[PDB]
């Protein structure tokens, strides 16, 4: 019938109880955890905090919808596009090869920056995380310098899948065709309600100082002693 | 005495052979400069230690 083992203290050899939390993880495993907790502890300045108040999933998928359908041509529709720029030009009489990129979003970084400085980017999308964080830290600040609606969005790996690369620091969505002025004209509104309307409280917003659940439930069990 | 490595054995064998006299067909050669062996070791005089 039954055999009952009490894996109590000292009374029987337990089963293979999952440890996976008190084990010695390899260096990078702990070190990438101690990294995302250390920058929750500290007093995050009001300029770096900006990237931990991203859009919500409500319009983030919509923002990735535009960036996706206005994504560049994938080295195959690029090389056969400029090929019809010779096929129908070699048959053309002369002086007519005129072709350009059909319509896409400015997806580089130094190409995006110029889309802002020119004020030709209608609105820009910015990535939550880039390894040299300073590489895009200033991006949400020359926007309200040039009054472009900006958008700090939750993952650069999700600005890559839409475009086509692996990662993307910031996408700029410049002039669009009248098939889709409806969906973005609201996106600009749905996002500056989160970044430009908030410009005052953003630049005065010290983040972090988020204590543990271990060392701040302790600070709950002592106001329980009050 | 009885333990010598084979490598140390190969090196004393290469010395037992080098300890033979110049053969008497060498000193009738046209212009040699050899009359004696002048590298003959005697086991008592000088030791090899290898």
């Amino acid at each position: 019938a039954a055999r009952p083992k009490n894996f109590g203290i000292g009374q029987d050899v337990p089963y293979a109880r999952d440890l996976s939390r008190f084990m010695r993880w390899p260096t990078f495993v702990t070190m990438q955890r101690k990294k995302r907790v250390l920058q929750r502890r500290l007093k995050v300045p009001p300029a770096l905090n900006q990237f931990t108040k991203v859009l919500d999933r409500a319009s983030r998928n919509e923002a990735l919808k535009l960036i996706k359908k206005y994504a560049p041509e994938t080295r195959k529709a690029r090389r056969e596009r400029l090929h019809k720029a010779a096929e129908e030009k070699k048959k053309d009489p002369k002086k007519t090869v005129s072709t350009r990129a059909p319509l896409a979003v400015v997806t580089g970084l130094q190409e995006v920056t110029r889309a802002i400085e020119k004020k030709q980017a209608r609105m820009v999308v910015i990535a939550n995380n880039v390894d040299p964080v300073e590489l895009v830290l200033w991006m949400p600040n020359l926007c309200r310098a040039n009054k472009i609606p900006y958008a700090i969005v939750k993952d650069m790996a999700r600005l890559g899948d839409a475009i086509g690369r692996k990662t993307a620091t910031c996408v700029a969505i410049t002039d669009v065709n009248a098939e889709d002025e409806a969906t973005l004209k609201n996106l600009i509104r749905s996002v500056n309600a989160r970044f430009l309307s908030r410009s005052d409280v953003i630049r005065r917003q010290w983040g972090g100082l988020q204590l543990s659940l271990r060392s701040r439930a302790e600070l709950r069990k002592k106001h329980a002693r009050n | 005495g009885r333990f010598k490595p084979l490598a140390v054995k190969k090196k004393y064998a290469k010395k037992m052979n080098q300890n033979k006299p110049v053969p008497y067909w060498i000193r009738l050669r046209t212009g040699n400069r050899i009359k004696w062996n002048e590298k003959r070791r005697h086991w008592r005089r000088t030791k090899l230690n290898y």
Partner: protein, 245 residues
């Protein structure tokens, strides 16, 4: 001149503890989950004699809480502990003479040997033969016990340290006089290499600050400064009270 015997000793070349006939380091069982939220029984099976120590070392086996083995622990033996005593070393452990129940849970005014300063270092204090500590005070608001070390110097340790109950074995070793240089030879041949002690005043004034002269005299006062450099810090180091009382 040359370096002095004392300075010429932290190189630890020849003057290094021998420990070949020694057993492992004798210390309490590792402070795992079992010795915090309960106890675990352990049988004393063998009481050996680590060469170079007056206290008996008792081989205590416990069960490994997690694997199926029987982990074996080498501990210093409190006096009275015999082979087959079923020692308990945990939280809820009883306080018989040999158990390792935690220090802030032992009753006050009690007698504890093999106490440990830090909570986990597996027993440091009161661990030579016949030595022990008396628990004086618990401070449950601070959570730290003040026990009286076997030197008079009474300190405060945390109330979660562990501690055996009793006196370390081999008490009364230091009272049987040696009567001969040969019984001091065999004492230190299990211990390190410091015997015989040549008096520095019988040395040459190249090998020691005292040596020299036509008479064997310390030329300058033996009491040397606390701050004095090594090779000079010889004699009575920072002696604050000097000579026969």
């Amino acid at each position: 001149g040359k370096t002095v015997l004392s300075c010429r000793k932290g190189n630890g070349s020849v003057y290094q503890v021998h420990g070949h006939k020694r057993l492992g380091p004798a210390k309490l069982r590792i402070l795992d989950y079992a010795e915090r939220h309960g106890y675990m029984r352990g049988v004393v099976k063998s009481i050996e004699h680590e060469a170079g120590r007056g206290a008996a070392l008792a081989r205590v086996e416990f069960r490994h809480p997690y694997k199926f083995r029987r982990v074996k622990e080498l501990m210093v033996a409190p006096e009275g502990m015999f082979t087959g005593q079923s020692v308990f070393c945990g939280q809820k452990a009883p306080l018989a003479i040999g158990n390792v129940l935690p220090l802030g849970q032992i009753t006050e005014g009690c007698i504890v040997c093999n106490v440990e300063a830090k909570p986990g270092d597996r027993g440091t204090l009161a661990r030579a033969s016949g030595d022990y500590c008396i628990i004086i005070s618990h401070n449950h608001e601070t959570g730290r016990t003040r026990l009286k070390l076997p030197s008079g110097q009474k300190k405060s340790v945390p109330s979660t340290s562990r501690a055996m109950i009793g006196i370390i074995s081999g008490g009364g070793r230091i009272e049987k006089p040696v009567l001969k240089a040969g019984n001091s030879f065999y004492r230190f041949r299990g211990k390190r290499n410091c015997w015989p002690k040549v008096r520095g005043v019988a040395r040459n004034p190249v090998e020691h600050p005292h040596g020299g002269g036509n008479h064997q005299h310390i030329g300058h006062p033996s009491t040397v400064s606390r701050h004095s450099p090594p090779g000079q810090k010889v004699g009575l180091i920072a002696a604050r009270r000097t000579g026969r009382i």
